[PDB]
Design a protein around this ligand. Sequence first.
Ligand SMILES: NC(=O)c1ccc[n+]([C@@H]2O[C@H](COP(=O)([O-])OP(=O)(O)OC[C@H]3O[C@@H](n4cnc5c(N)ncnc54)[C@H](OP(=O)(O)O)[C@@H]3O)[C@@H](O)[C@H]2O)c1
Ligand SMILES: CCc1c(-c2ccccc2)nn2c(=O)cc(-c3cccc(C(=O)O)c3)[nH]c12
Length: 204
Amino acid sequence: AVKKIAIFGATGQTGLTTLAQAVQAGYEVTVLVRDSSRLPSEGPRPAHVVVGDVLQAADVDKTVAGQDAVIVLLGTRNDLSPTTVMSEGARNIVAAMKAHGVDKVVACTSAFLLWDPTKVPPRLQAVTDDHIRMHKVLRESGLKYVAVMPPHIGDQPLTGAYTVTLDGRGPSRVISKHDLGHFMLRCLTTDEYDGHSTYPSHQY
Ligand SMILES: NC(=O)c1ccc[n+]([C@@H]2O[C@H](COP(=O)([O-])OP(=O)(O)OC[C@H]3O[C@@H](n4cnc5c(N)ncnc54)[C@H](OP(=O)(O)O)[C@@H]3O)[C@@H](O)[C@H]2O)c1
Ligand SMILES: CCc1c(-c2ccccc2)nn2c(=O)cc(-c3cccc(C(=O)O)c3)[nH]c12
């Protein structure tokens, strides 16, 4: 079973609760972060910290070495500008996984990849464009890839009661950050989502 994981984006909104739940679950967690100051100083903390940039292949290589699986929660925080950080990060992550023989990656993009493209809000298109590029990188990689495509990420509590919809849109348009992280970790315990798109959603 999976015991050692790397989490990219561990200091973000979803990352921080995914890191907490993973350490609570008994995972040996490695994180790549841009500043150790953005990690929690008390509470569940990672067993291993690499400080650097997902845009530096050497930094990604050090993080992926020795792991059983990888979680990707990269994002742009509040910035809606055009960007390639997530898709270039993903190229580095895939390269490292292949060099080291890590075969399992669970990666968050967005449910807009399952929407009619004329319906995606133009204000969000620039970020969505790189979500599409990142999904393409991971799809084409040949790795065991679970594409997690959430709708709106909220701040409702952990429930573990969300619906998981495969290869399509689900019945609710929100998922709490805690349940999204919970789902990311569930994907490490099973191969039944490999190669599929996954839409977690719930009514709070
Ligand atoms: N907001 C929504 O409703 C919504 C809906 C659907 C999908 N999504 C997508 O879900 C994903 C995660 O959402 P989120 O809000 O939890 O992400 P987030 O709060 O924006 O956190 C982004 C993470 O990416 C890391 N990161 C960014 N650039 C990096 C770089 N060059 N090198 C290393 N690390 C880097 C950040 O590290 P730092 O701490 O150093 O900044 C941070 O940990 C995002 O891709 C988002 O677009 C969001
Ligand atoms: C593109 C990511 C994003 C962001 C964002 C935030 C900060 C910086 C950059 C981007 N905010 N944000 C939302 O508020 C809602 C959705 C979303 C996705 C899919 C389906 C639905 C739905 O309504 O069904 C909603 N995506 C989203």
